[PDB]
Every structure is written in structure tokens, then in C-alpha cells.
Design a protein around this ligand. Structure first.
Ligand SMILES: Nc1ncnc2c1ncn2[C@@H]1O[C@H](COP(=O)(O)OP(=O)(O)OP(=O)(O)O)[C@@H](O)[C@H]1O
Ligand SMILES: Nc1ncnc2c1ncn2[C@@H]1O[C@H](COP(=O)(O)OP(=O)(O)OP(=O)(O)O)[C@@H](O)[C@H]1O
Ligand SMILES: Nc1ncnc2c1ncn2[C@@H]1O[C@H](COP(=O)(O)OP(=O)(O)OP(=O)(O)O)[C@@H](O)[C@H]1O
Ligand SMILES: Nc1ncnc2c1ncn2[C@@H]1O[C@H](COP(=O)(O)OP(=O)(O)OP(=O)(O)O)[C@@H](O)[C@H]1O
Ligand SMILES: Nc1ncnc2c1ncn2[C@@H]1O[C@H](COP(=O)(O)OP(=O)(O)OP(=O)(O)O)[C@@H](O)[C@H]1O
Ligand SMILES: Nc1ncnc2c1ncn2[C@@H]1O[C@H](COP(=O)(O)OP(=O)(O)OP(=O)(O)O)[C@@H](O)[C@H]1O
Ligand SMILES: Nc1ncnc2c1ncn2[C@@H]1O[C@H](COP(=O)(O)OP(=O)(O)OP(=O)(O)O)[C@@H](O)[C@H]1O
Ligand SMILES: Nc1ncnc2c1ncn2[C@@H]1O[C@H](COP(=O)(O)OP(=O)(O)OP(=O)(O)O)[C@@H](O)[C@H]1O
Ligand SMILES: [Mg+2]
Ligand SMILES: [Mg+2]
Ligand SMILES: [Mg+2]
Ligand SMILES: [Mg+2]
Ligand SMILES: [Mg+2]
Ligand SMILES: [Mg+2]
Lengths: 403, 403, 402, 402
């Protein structure tokens, strides 16, 4: 009964091809699900050491999409989603505000805590002043030291980012207040954010232009109050994440959630076989995750399928569904990403890679890791003659290496 | 002549399957021989650093069955068996007693040595008092300080463990004396033992409810006085253990022992081929052990078959005999156990694993090792869609990995 | 300028004629004129060294520990009060439980005090007792009244009963705990079997005139020292340590004088000094005992450059106070058993230690550190021919080594 | 207080005018007034240093070893008696075998004494000899009578025969062993070829008036010292060492006085002291030699704080005994050959060592440790101009180094 043969990343190499593709001109975009299109093929995994609201924003601005983890309160997990959801490429709807009668003592705690010293001043939604770093080098309430209503530089909602950069610079100020017909605060946008959005203009957003975001839950029932709470928080894609997704209890959860939310984008995981991939698709998954022990699952449980064979078997299973496959774990170096995609994955998940970054809960700023990795994928596509992630997943051939 | 190909644990992985099996509800029981059923698929090996009476009791209470080693006197080996055999789940028949005229000086040596300070007091079988830790904080003979006959809390043989827990608690005491119609001591059972037997209620016992136990001998004749002495001591399964069990001298011993004890459960080992497995079965083995160099046997002698192929070849050989196969040695991690079973073993032997424990002759208590390992097997069965050890040995498919 | 000054390591004790064995030597010494110790050892007033638990253990070995001042004034009083409520083996005001108490709260009440034996009291009267045995099985959720040994089955002894007696009652009933009661069956205290055995094996407890374990506490320069003083005096502290990085200050001397005024009665330890004139200041300000040690953590000297090597320091204080009957404690610099003996030989009437006990069970086991430290002292007493601490303070001779 | 005190490392020996070569220097020195050594070295009374085997080897190099007191009184007497039964090269009371003895027991009798040559004695008379040669082949199981060289083929010498003579008999017959016999052909002892060669190459054995190797033993404070004393006196010990961690005790002084009473005759070493008045006590109590060394295992000072640096110690004893003719031994602190020379120069008449020999073949090889240690002494004797130990004790000069 002891026979088949299966292949991992280190077992294969990608062959070079005639190419007209250049690294800086390859297109890194890919359909995560039939309705969500990433600009880079990367997801951050929902681990308490990788992804909360901070990194999810950082990654969606890069082109990707982060997944808030369930090792936190139901209510704290929903507010994380809302925090990403209230983000644009570079405008912050629902900023952290103050009121005129905020004491200035209580105001320096907000800045010591929040890391930015600049807040719009409000009065039940009506914008009323603004108080920033410069207005604190003295001692009373905000109202004494705030820049009053009549001198506020603002922009109506809809005005393009350039018109606000013009305005911000002409007025020699760092914070633009987005404002209503009735002067109700609708958004805050710094000079920092507009520069960081003219470069890297490939944020992954929905049809309302707001940052896309995922969230994970486990299966096993009882998660209904949670699954409902992240939907209510307007998550883009719900992750129903399992150590073994071909079990009946997981298929069940997925069947149930698809009933209560016919258009919500769901990833089920993790499978490792064509059967699991079909059953996860058949229960209602928008995309399936693949990663059974690629890892103590192997040493402890004795169970696993190496990623190269697992991905390509899930993908063969699902031809003609439009249900994409995510490769999850086993990721050592950058070229492993390229192999995973070449084996037919439409995106990859990573978590250990990003677990020490700045924007995560030994460090780095996210934009540099994503750059080194995405430059590696760019190299590969130029070498394989593959302009789009579409081309790579279907064109590039493999070669088997030994030692 | 230099051709075949053979597979070890690290050469294979177990594939995931559709599953309705949960770890905490999988059934770990398996037929060791046609008449002995373990509750977990584990044997401890008969090594002077692993298994004597202490660990054999510890393991049989867990579900398994330990094998007393032959690196000790014939007479000391039989008394080890009797010691396990006089154990129930949690009642000690033939406790360590005293008599009223035992000096109390000689009594503290018994406690310094034996590790428990509580002994029933007897007078040629008649129970007569009891002396425990509390009765020593003074200085004469036992008779001065013992709790007299008329105040002894006892229970007739047959009373359930709960009725004795009731009685022990109602009387605010830690030791229950099991007693005859004629007040002859028949057993001792502490409060400790009843708690440790309400949890972990899967002790592996015979039809008299007494702890099961194995014992090893070598072949090569002259062992007859020993083989007879362990039978006389009421061992459950005799191990006739050899570096090479397909030799004629071992087949012979086994043929002879089966003649003198037609219903004694015998394991012969070790073989590594279908031929050896058939010949060991044909000589009269209840179960065959498989492990030729999986180990200096390999480096020194140059000889061996990797376990995965050896097990599955022995098991194919023996289809339709009801003679089970034990995988022996080569065991690194927990998932190796699962692979061995999946290759068709009905139990596994381990020894190095348990060589530092508490209950063995760098440590641990046995119940924790057996827990971590059996939880690993439980993981695997949930992943492979396999509820019983029966299902695992016959359903779960394999996948071949390289590097 | 420049006068030579020796540390412990610069000296060695001379063997003299000896009629003293280790087992013979008398380790007792007068802390102050009212307070005599049974081993010449003090615990430092440090958050990682001495609190109520350790101050009771030191006392049971023969010494005194000092409760640190890193607490609210009220919390420290209870520490000191907690020590004071231990006699020989009796334990006054033991923790009780009411026959209402739920067992889920009773076992809640177990994991934090450590023990499981609580007397059951119902608004003054003593009605039962629960021990870990009664807890073993859930009654059926009911309360403590449904597991307890009841009043008509309580084994008690009248207060004043000899300790050897209520031990024999304890053996005869085979029970671990003894209830001590007044003539109205009111709970005077709890005495366990374990305590009585640690009172034959530790007959050298440094106790009070009412039989209570002894204890000290430290106050500092903080802007509420006055009230800290009074809290401890009223909480019944045996000795007060006005403790200073630099006791030859006018701030300390102030406090020392102001306190001896308000409390003509209270045994006072002032420190630290390292000079004769420093010792005179603390004495004349009204101290019972001077603590010496400025310099002997070796960052005092490094960051500041200030210090006096311990042996010269101790011996200048002793000499500056020659005739006054004011004792001198040696604080810090003490690594080995042999440093203790040198401190006492230079005239210290007792020794303070902190980091030598900082990782003990009683620290925030200790029976053993004291046994080997005091065992070396005994060795040294035998080798030098001094069987009384007062002998080793005045008799032993020194030799300069390189 | 405080008088300076030097160790070995604090001093250096001054070169003086010298007419002495290393080969010239006379290493002999008077242990006591009856006992003179040929090298100024003693073995310590330690379970891992000196027993009968080593006490014979030290004696053959010129010194005396001391049998430890970690034994039954009777077992120690046999140790001491065992040493005493070696003359120059003769070996009295050698192990014999009876013509009954089975060879399976004879070879059993080989692996534990080490050797294979046993004289064969049948109830007094000498009847043969078996050596490893006769054992080589099984006779056919028979006994020793069937392999032995028989009486009519025995090569013997009459007791009193010169050692050079019975060597030449040995060569002439080409046999390894020589039997020494009285005028009745009774076995007086055994002399091997190996011994005679180690008696020309080691002509400096510290022997007794009957020609017997010399030896000492230690008694302690234990509750049966009296009988330990007598066992050794009767077993024929040369010197008795009443040995103490602290000999300025009234317990030792007691024992010293009580023994010199019972034995006006017996050469006694008392120790250890480290003071003049300590040396006087031991002398006046009736000692032949005082052992010095309290402090020089360096845990004496660490656990206890007590000790005197070895050089000051040795020199205070020597001076305190100036005129009495009582010698002084220096015990411990001795690492190098150069420490020995400093001890003797400070006035020690001899030196004790333990850990310097603790891992030798003769310990529970040694010819070599003594050769290099004594070779350095010779070097130092040449460089300082002292050819007699008495010279190096009184002539050499010291210089203080840092
Ligand atoms: N009140 C707020 N609520 C939410 N996010 C805010 C708020 N104020 C600032 N931010 C965000 O946090 C970032 C911190 O920027 P910060 O206010 O320190 O910079 P700045 O003062 O505009 O710029 P500079 O550092 O050039 O002086 C902003 O760029 C914006 O992304
Ligand atoms: N949109 C705005 N309309 C009117 N005044 C504004 C606006 N944004 C900022 N200001 C005011 O301009 C001044 C500086 O604002 P800005 O955010 O550029 O400074 P800052 O963050 O305090 O500067 P720094 O870079 O020194 O930390 C403050 O008095 C602030 O209240
Ligand atoms: N006389 C005996 N002979 C054989 N086995 C015994 C004997 N007495 C006790 N045992 C076993 O050894 C164990 C040691 O238990 P022990 O007597 O120290 O506990 P106990 O006093 O009943 O309990 P506790 O620790 O709660 O006070 C018992 O739990 C039982 O398994
Ligand atoms: N079955 C019994 N019948 C009568 N008396 C008993 C019985 N078992 C124990 N005792 C008595 O009860 C008392 C305590 O018994 P138990 O075994 O509970 O205590 P222990 O092991 O000495 O306690 P500890 O937990 O303090 O070590 C003793 O006097 C003992 O003789
Ligand atoms: N209610 C209490 N209040 C204060 N101190 C207590 C109390 N109970 C116990 N102690 C202290 O704790 C110790 C006894 O605790 P413990 O509960 O472990 O005794 P025990 O179980 O009855 O004796 P053993 O464990 O030997 O069978 C005593 O030394 C005693 O000082
Ligand atoms: N003074 C007393 N009077 C009456 N009953 C008592 C008394 N002290 C304890 N008991 C009862 O005796 C039993 C427990 O005895 P004890 O307190 O001496 O041991 P324990 O510390 O609970 O047990 P263990 O040693 O097993 O931990 C309980 O039923 C308890 O209520
Ligand atoms: N019977 C004996 N009794 C006591 N000592 C003995 C006895 N026999 C030998 N010795 C000691 O052992 C040494 C000789 O032992 P050994 O048996 O090795 O001599 P050997 O074989 O005759 O000489 P070689 O080995 O050089 O040929 C001597 O130095 C001697 O002191
Ligand atoms: N004094 C003696 N008189 C007669 N025969 C002797 C005498 N000494 C030894 N022999 C005999 O000489 C033979 C052995 O000679 P010797 O004892 O000198 O050497 P050995 O130590 O046995 O041998 P080896 O050097 O080979 O170990 C034996 O036959 C022995 O009995
Ligand atoms: Mg700014
Ligand atoms: Mg700025
Ligand atoms: Mg007990
Ligand atoms: Mg108990
Ligand atoms: Mg107890
Ligand atoms: Mg030879």
C-alpha cells in the first residue's frame, strides 16, 4: 500500500525560457477569488505574532491582504477589521479625534500612546478645530491651544489626492481634513500618507476604495457569533482555518456560512489532496488553502504531502471552477514562492517571514521584505518568459533535481 | 544480485483523508495476539534499563503491557511477574504486611526502603491491625502503635471501587483493606489508587481483572528451567527474543514451548522477511516481532531491512493467520508509530523512549510520555479518517518523499 | 593624609589555646541592652530578602529579620504584626472560615495561603474544623458546614496546656491539628503537629517576654517617616532600624533624636557609619545599636569613590563606643562563614546579611544556610579558644596577610 | 592588633657564597633526638596517601610515612608491623604455601598479592618453592607439591650471609629468588634479586637499629585513642603522631601528657600548631617533634577564617623552641621543590606532604617525585651555600618580595 511519490520545493527547479519579460515590468496581480484581485500574490497568515490591524493595512497598501487572527476577543477582532476597512490608499476615515473640552493632560497621554500627536477637534461629528504637535509647547483644555474653526484648511470629499497635496503645500501644513457639505469630519490625510501613496500606488482595495482585509475563524461550531461579528465588521474574505479541512465538521461550517452570506468570500483550509480540494470547493469555498504538514505536524502526527505535489493536485482537481488555490507554509526563500505559483497556486500565504517586522504586533519595515521577495519573483518571471501570474501558473516548466 | 529497494519511516508520509474522526474519540485498542487486546498499541522492551515490575504495572494501567527482562535471576524474574500479576487496575493483592510483634525499628527500615509507610498487620493471613505513617511519631513492637482489629475499616472482596471510596471518605482514611468472609487479608487499596483508576480507566487486564504482563527469554536451550518458571508465575505472553529469529535454533525453542503450553501466548522475534514471519508463525508464535537492524547491527554486521518494507512484508506473509505483527525499534518520533501501524503493525515496541522515566529502573513520569505519544497517534488518525487501529492498518495510504 | 585600612581578606584569625569544641560554643550575643539573640545574625531590610515569612524563619533559627520599607505604612504593620503572632509553636489569630463558606471558595481559599486546615468560627464561637481530608470528595453546591468535623467531635486543649501535653493529645487522636481554646471555648490559636516537632528541633527561637517571636523594621528618609515609626511601634515591633546610606547625616541624626524623644523605650538601630565620629553621632543621638558598613554590590566605591574597608570600619566603631555598652552590627561584605567570625572578632556584636539569603524558600531553604554559616563560626570558635561571642569579640587576635 | 605574616610566596632565598654542588649536599636531618632521616620528607596520614605499601617506599627513599587512623586498631598494627618486617633487602615472615595447596588456589593466591614466588612450608619445615614458572602448565587437579622445586634442589643462604654474597649465589644458579634459613633449615625470610638491585640503587633507606625500615602512625581524639596508642607501640612503630586540626587543645595536650607518662621512651610528634605558645604547650607536654601548619585544601581559612601563613608560623615555632633540641616539621602548603627549601630555611627540620604523593603507584611511581623534589632542594642548597640541612636551617637568608 506503500507507494506513490511526491515532490517538495527543493525537489524542483524552474526552467528558463525565451523571454520578452523584464523584472520591473512584470505584472504581479492575481485573482485570489473570483471577485478579489490582489496586486501581489501574498497573504499574511492569521497568527498572534504576524497580523493585526497594523500589518493588514501595511500589506494591503503593498498589493496584498492581511488576515486578523482569532487569538483575541470577538469584539476586539471586529474592531481590527473596521480599522483596516476605514482606511483608503492614503486617507483615514474615522480618525482619532478630540473635543474642545478634552484636557490637555489627557491629550499628551493620547499622543504618548497613539504615536501621532495630531488630532482633529470635533463636537459630535462637526469639525471644530485641530490640535497638533506644534500646539503643545506651553503648559486648561484643547480649546485654548487648538487652531480654530475659521482657519482650518479642508477639502470636500471626492477631491483628488493631488488637489489636497497642492492645498497642504500652499498652506505649509501637514494634515488635510476631509469634510462634509455641513463641515462634518469625514477623513484625515497627512502629507506623509500622500507621498507614500504616489509611490507604491498598488494598494489592494474594494469598489469603495477602502483597504481590503481578511479574518480567520476556526470551525467546530460556537464560532457563529464570531463569524457574524466579522461580517458585520465588513471583512472582505473570511478564513475558516483548520489543521485538517477535509473533516466533516469543517465542510459543515463552510456549508452553513455560505448559507447565511451567499456573496461573502470564504477561504477554507487546509487540504492537501484533490479530494479535499473538491470537497472544500463543493461546500462553498471561494478559494482553498493547501498545507498539510510542510512543521511538527510531520514529526508528531506522521502526516503530510509535500507542497509541490499537493498544490498541483488541488489545482488539477479544481480546473473549471474558478476557485483559486493558496499555497500555505513550507516557504523558505523567495524562489519557493515562484515554484508554488508555477505549480499552480494563485497566491501564497506567509507568516514567519513577517513575524518580526515593524508593522507586526529582529525587525524591519514591511515594505522592504515585500520588496526583496517581489523582486525575486520578478527575476524568475523574466527568466521563465512569463509576464503575468496567469502565465507563470500555466506556462513555466519544471526540472527534477537530485543532489 | 544487487537489487530490490526498501523503505524506512523517513521515506514515507501518511496522506490525509476525508475524516469524521476526532483525536479524543479515536479508539486506540488493538489485538496483540488472537486472545490479548491492548487498549493502546504499545509494548515496553525487555531491557535492564526500561522494564521491571515497576514500569510494567505503570504501562498496563495505561493500556499497554511491559516485558520483564532476563538480565536477572530466574527466581527474581518470576517474582517480578507475580508482582505485576497480583495487581488489579487499582487494588494490590498480596500487599507488604507486618505482624504485631514486628519491632518498630525494623518497621522504619521497611518504609525507608519501600517508599510507603503504611502496612496491614497480619497473623498468618488473618488481618489483625494496620499501621501507617501517622502511627510512628513517638519512639516496643508494632502491636503497641497499630490501629487495632476492632476499629479497622474494610470491604469484602467484590465490592466496587466506588463503594470503597465512599467508605474511605466517610471514615476520613486513606487505606482500604480488602477482606475475606473469615477476615483474612485479600487486598490493599489506597485513595491514591482509586483516583488514578477513575481517570485513565483503560488498564490492560486479563479475565481475572489482574494486570497483564510479559517476560523475555532468549533461545539456545537451557532456558527451559526459566521458561517454565515464568509460566508458573502466570505471565501473559512469553517473549522468545533473538537477534535473528529465522535461525533453526529459535524456531526449535518455539516449537518446544508451544508443545509444553498449548495456550500460552508467545511472541517470537526478530524477523524481517515474509519467510521469517511465516516460519515464526508456523512454529507456533501468537505474534511475530519485526526489527532486523533498524543500531550497530547495521554498521557492524552490514545486515538489515528498513522497517516500513519489513513490517508490510511480514504482514502480507501472514494474511489469514490472525497472527499480529509488532514493529520493534527504529522508532524516532510519534508519527513513526503511526507509520508503523499504517504499514500494518498491530502494536509497536519501544524501550529507549522510556529508559529514563520515573517507573523505569533525565526523567519523567510514564503517564506523560504515553500521553504525548498517544496524542500524536490521535492527531494522525483524525487526519487519515481512521477511527480504529483496525482502520489505520488497512485504510491509510502512503506517499513517497525524497528530500 | 592616608591611613591604612583592611578588609576581611587582609586578615586572618590566630589559633589560640582552646578548651572549646564546636558543639560547645555559645552563639548568643546582645543585640541591644534589652535584646539578646541566640545566633549573631540579622536579615537585611531588602525586598528580595526579608518579609514576614523570612522574619519568622530567622527568628526560629535564633536571629532577627527586618521588614523592608517598600510598602504602605499599613501593610508593613501587618507584616510586623504577623511575625509577632507566633509564639513557641502556637499560632494566634489563625485564619478561620465560616460554616457558610462554599467549598468552591474553600479550595479557592487553599491555593494561596498554602494550607488547608482552617478552624470554623461562626461569629465568635468555634463550631468545627475543615482540613484537606474533608475536601477530598464533593459533598454532593454545598458549603463548609457539610464537610467539617463538628463541634461535638473537636479535640481541643485549654490555653496554658504544656506543648508536650497537647502533642500527646494529638498522637492519641491521630489528628494533624490542635485547637487551643479559652475557658469559654473561644479560639485562642492553632498549634499543628509540624510546629511542635520544629520546636524540639529548633529550641533556640529568639522570643519576647510574652513568648512571641521577635522582629524589626526599617524606616527611611521619606517625607512620612514619622508615621511609619508609629505604625511599627504600635504594631509591636521589637527593634527599629533607622537605616541610611549615610547615617552621619543631619537628616538621620535628626530622626534618631526625634524618635528617642517620642519613645524613650524603643530599641533603635542607626546606620550605616564607618568612622569613630560617625559612631559617636549615632550613639549620642540615642541609638541602642550602630550598624557599620559603608563601601562593602560594589558600586558604592566605583560610582562614588567613598568607602571604608570593613574591618577597620567595624573596629573604629567598636573602639569609639568602648564603655557605652552600645553594640555594633556589621553590614555587608560578608561572603563566607569565615567573614562572620572576623567581623565579630573585630568587635561586632552581630552581623547583617542580605544577598546570602536572597533566594531561599522563606525569601520573597533557610534552615541550612544558617546551619553551615553558624557551623563555620563554631569551627572558628573552637580553633581560637572562644566559647562565648563576648570572648570572640575581645579575646581573638589578628594577623596581617598579603 | 595586626602583625604581618608571610607565606612561601612572599619570600625568596638569597644566593650566598657556595662551595657546595648539588651532588654534594647532605640531605639528612634529625626528625627527633633518636630518629635521623636521610631525606627531609614525611608522608601525611591520609587514606589516599600513605599505607604500608607507601610507608615502605618512602622509607626506601630515605623518609618516613605515617599510617592513617581510618582503620580498626588491629588492622593498623598489621600495617605498621608489615613495614617493620623489611630490612635492607631481606623480607621476614614472607607469605608461604603448604604442599597441600591446590594450584587452582595457588593461582587464586597470585592475582591479589601481586607475586607468584611462595616458599613452601609444611608445619614449620621448609620443603620447596613454587614460582610462576612451575605454574605455566597444569600438572595433569593436583596440588602445589606436584609443581614445586623440591627440598633437595633448594638454593638457600644462612641468615647473616652478606647481601653481595647471596646475590652471587643467585646469579650462579640463575634463579630469581633466594631462601634465607637458620641453622635448623627454618625459613628466616625471602630475598629476591629485584630487591638487592634496589638496595644498591637506593642505599639511603631510613632504617632501625635492628636494620628494619622505619615507620610512624597517627592517633586522633576518638574515644579509644589509648588502645590505638598501645597497639602501635607493641606492633613496633618508630614514631607516634598525635595529630590534631588544633593541637593547642586541652584534649591533645592531655593525650600527649598521658602517653609520655605511659611511655617515657616513645618518639612523639604533636601537631598542628602555628604559634610560639602553641609550640611550647606541645613541647612541655612532652613531644619529640612539633608539626606546624594551621591554614595551609584552602577551606580552613574560608569556612573558619583561622590560619597563620606558613613561613611566619614555622619560624615562630622554631624560635619558641630555640635551645630545647625539639625539631619542627612543616605540614602542607607545599607545592614546589622550592617551598620545601623555604620551610627548612625558616627552621623546619623536615617537611610533611600528602597531596604531592596522592596518586602514586605506592599510594592506596614515587621514586621519581622524590628525585625531582630532592633534586630541587639540592639546587637550592648549592645556590645558597648550605651543604647540610642544619646549615640551610640556620645559615640561609630571606628577602621580601611583592
Ligand atoms: N488623529 C489621527 N488618527 C489616526 N491616524 C492618524 C492621526 N494623525 C496621524 N495619523 C496617522 O499617523 C501618521 C503619523 O504622522 P504624524 O502625525 O506623526 O506626522 P506629521 O506631523 O504630519 O508629519 P511630520 O513627521 O513630517 O512632521 C500619519 O502620517 C497618519 O498616517
Ligand atoms: N488643516 C489645517 N488647517 C489649519 N491649521 C492646520 C491644519 N493642519 C495643521 N494646522 C496647524 O498648523 C500648525 C502646524 O501643523 P502641522 O501638522 O504641520 O505641524 P506639527 O505636526 O505640529 O509639526 P512638526 O513637524 O514640528 O512636528 C499647527 O498650529 C496646526 O494646528
Ligand atoms: N503495604 C503496601 N504494600 C504494597 N503497596 C503499597 C502498600 N502501601 C501502599 N502501597 C502503594 O504505594 C502507594 C504509596 O502510597 P502512600 O501509602 O504513601 O499514600 P497514602 O498515605 O495513602 O496517601 P497520602 O499521600 O494522600 O497521605 C499507595 O498509593 C499504593 O499504591
Ligand atoms: N482501614 C483502616 N481502618 C482503620 N484505621 C485505619 C485504616 N486506614 C488507616 N487507618 C488509621 O487512620 C490513621 C491515618 O491513616 P492514613 O493512612 O489516612 O494516614 P497516614 O498515611 O499516616 O497520613 P498522612 O497523610 O499524614 O501521611 C492511622 O492511625 C491509621 O492507622
Ligand atoms: N489556619 C492556619 N493559620 C495559620 N497558619 C497555619 C494554619 N494552618 C497551618 N498553618 C501553618 O502551616 C503549617 C501546617 O500546614 P499544613 O496544612 O500543611 O499541616 P498538615 O497537613 O495538617 O500536616 P501534614 O501535612 O504533615 O499531614 C504549620 O507549621 C502552621 O504554622
Ligand atoms: N482538633 C481536631 N478535632 C477534631 N477533628 C480534627 C481535628 N483536627 C483535625 N481533625 C479532623 O481530622 C481529619 C484530618 O486530620 P488532620 O487534620 O490531622 O490531617 P490532614 O492534614 O487533613 O491530612 P493529610 O496528612 O492527609 O494531608 C479531618 O476529618 C479533620 O476535620
Ligand atoms: N612471597 C613474598 N612475600 C613477600 N614479598 C614478596 C614475596 N615474593 C615477592 N615479594 C616481593 O615482590 C618482589 C618480587 O616479586 P616478583 O614475583 O615479581 O619477582 P620475580 O619474578 O622472581 O623477578 P622477575 O620478575 O624480575 O623475573 C620483591 O621486591 C619482593 O619484595
Ligand atoms: N631458591 C631456589 N632454589 C631452587 N629453585 C628455585 C629457587 N628460586 C626459584 N627456583 C626455581 O626456579 C624456577 C623459577 O626461577 P625464578 O624464581 O628465579 O623466576 P620466575 O620469576 O618464576 O620467572 P620469570 O622471570 O619468567 O617470571 C622455578 O622452577 C622455581 O621453583
Ligand atoms: Mg509633525
Ligand atoms: Mg515635521
Ligand atoms: Mg499519607
Ligand atoms: Mg496525606
Ligand atoms: Mg500528613
Ligand atoms: Mg624475570
Amino acid at each position: 500500500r506503500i507507494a506513490k511519490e511526491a515532490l517538495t520545493f527543493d525537489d524542483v527547479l524552474l526552467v528558463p525560457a525565451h523571454s520578452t519579460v523584464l523584472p520591473n515590468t512584470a505584472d504581479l496581480s492575481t485573482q485570489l477569488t473570483k471577485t478579489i484581485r490582489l496586486n501581489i500574490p501574498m497573504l499574511s497568515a492569521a497568527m498572534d505574532t504576524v497580523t493585526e490591524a497594523r500589518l493588514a493595512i501595511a500589506l494591503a497598501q503593498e498589493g496584498g491582504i492581511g488576515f486578523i487572527h482569532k487569538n483575541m476577543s470577538i469584539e476586539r477582532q471586529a474592531e481590527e477589521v473596521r480599522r483596516v476597512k476605514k482606511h483608503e490608499s492614503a486617507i483615514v476615515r474615522d480618525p482619532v479625534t478630540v473635543t474642545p473640552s478634552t484636557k490637555i493632560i489627557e491629550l499628551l497621554q493620547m499622543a504618548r500612546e497613539y504615536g501621532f500627536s495630531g488630532f482633529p477637534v470635533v463636537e459630535q461629528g462637526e469639525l471644530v478645530g485641530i490640535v497638533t504637535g506644534r500646539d503643545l509647547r506651553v503648559k486648561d483644555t484643547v480649546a485654548a491651544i487648538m487652531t480654530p474653526k475659521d482657519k482650518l484648511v479642508t477639502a470636500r470629499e471626492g477631491t483628488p489626492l493631488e488637489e489636497m497635496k497642492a492645498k497642504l503645500y500652499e498652506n505649509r501644513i501637514e494634515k488635510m481634513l476631509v469634510v462634509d457639505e455641513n463641515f462634518y469630519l469625514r477623513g484625515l490625510v497627512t502629507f506623509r500618507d500622500i507621498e507614500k501613496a504616489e509611490r507604491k500606488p498598488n494598494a489592494c482595495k474594494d469598489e469603495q476604495g477602502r483597504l481590503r482585509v481578511g479574518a480567520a475563524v476556526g470551525a467546530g461550531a460556537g464560532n457563529e457569533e464570531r463569524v457574524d461579528a466579522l461580517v458585520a465588521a465588513g471583512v472582505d474574505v473570511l478564513l475558516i482555518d483548520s489543521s485538517h479541512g477535509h473533516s466533516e465538521g469543517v465542510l459543515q461550517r463552510i456549508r452553513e456560512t455560505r448559507a447565511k452570506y451567499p456573496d461573502l468570500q470564504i477561504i477554507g483550509g487546509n487540504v492537501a489532496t484533490a479530494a479535499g480540494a473538491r470537497a472544500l470547493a463543493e461546500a462553498g469555498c471561494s478559494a482553498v488553502k493547501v498545507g498539510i504538514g510542510p512543521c511538527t505536524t510531520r514529526i508528531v502526527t506522521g502526516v503530510g504531502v509535500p507542497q509541490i505535489t499537493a498544490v498541483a493536485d488541488a489545482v488539477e482537481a479544481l480546473e473549471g471552477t474558478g476557485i483559486p488555490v493558496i499555497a500555505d507554509g513550507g516557504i523558505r526563500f523567495s524562489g519557493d514562492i515562484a515554484k508554488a505559483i508555477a505549480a499552480g497556486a494563485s497566491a501564497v500565504m506567509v507568516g514567519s517571514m513577517l513575524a518580526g517586522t515593524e508593522e507586526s504586533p529582529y525587525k524591519g519595515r514591511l515594505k522592504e521584505i515585500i520588496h526583496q521577495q517581489m523582486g525575486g519573483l520578478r527575476s524568475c518571471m523574466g527568466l521563465t518568459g512569463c509576464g503575468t501570474i496567469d502565465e507563470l501558473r500555466t506556462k513555466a516548466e519544471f526540472v527534477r533535481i537530485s543532489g
